[model samples]
Every structure is written in C-alpha cells, then in structure tokens.
Target: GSHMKVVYYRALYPFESRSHDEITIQPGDIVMVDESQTGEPGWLGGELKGKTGWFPANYAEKIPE
Candidate 1:
C-alpha cells in the first residue's frame, strides 16, 4: 500500500447526520481518517467500525504525534 500510516482522530463533538452525507459520531469516538479520500476542506473521509463516510473536520481533532 502507498502512504499507509495510522492517523487517529477524536471527535470533538457529536453529530447524528449531515445534509450531504449521512453519518453518525459520538463525542470522544475515535475515527480513522482515510488518507486516499482526504484533502477536502470541512469534510473528512473517515472509517468507523466497518463502514466509511464523510465527517466534519471541525468536529474531530487529530490525535497528536
């Protein structure tokens, strides 16, 4: 795989759904950002459990290195 690395994010707030894409997130829930689907502002492509969707970037904080 290319550019493979573990990038973690913690939800700063809770979100039940969005207008563009439906997604659910709880405060403090960990989300793994999909590098391949990244680069978009405001929205972040992430994987939670076995599913993937776009979440608000402002709602999550990157786990510090």
Candidate 2:
C-alpha cells in the first residue's frame, strides 16, 4: 500500500457509444453521462456539465485509431 489515497472509477476522456450523442464542449464545461449496460441507454446519454455516473470497467475500448 502507498501513503497516498487511491481511487478507481470508470471514465472516458471523451466517452463513446452507438447512442452517445455528441455535443459542443467549451473551454471549461463540466460533463456528465449515464451510460447503458443494455447496448444503449435511452434518455440518458448526452454531453453536459458536472457529476456523471460510473460506467463498468469492461464497457469500452480505447484503441488509438
């Protein structure tokens, strides 16, 4: 163990899904998202400001392509 507190959360610097709607992000806009476990979450995906729910660690991929 280390002296510093460690925390774990699932996040995407810019999240993506078939249903994740794109939005215009500004210089300091807070973002939020309520991801789906059943393919795509309806009425719960968007780009906004502050405080988003946690996604599963196995829910996405970050391929550099």
lDDT of 2 by residue, 1-65 (tens): 01212232223344433333434333333434334334343222323444334333333332331
Score candidate 1 by lDDT: 0.71
Predicted structure with the largest lDDT when compared to the true one:
1
Give all TM-scores, in the order shown.
Answer: 0.69, 0.24
After superposition, the stretches of candidate 1 with alpha carbons farther than 4 Å from their true spots are 1-6, 18-21, 35-41
lDDT per model vs. reference: 0.71, 0.34
Give the Å error, residue 63, model 1.
Answer: 0.3
Residue-by-residue lDDT tens digits, candidate 1, 1-65: 12337688898888877564546888898988764343444566667877667777788888997
Error of 2 at 8 (Å): 14
Instruction: Give per-residue lDDT, candidate 1, residue 36.
Output: 36
Query: How many clashes in each candidate?
Result: 0, 2
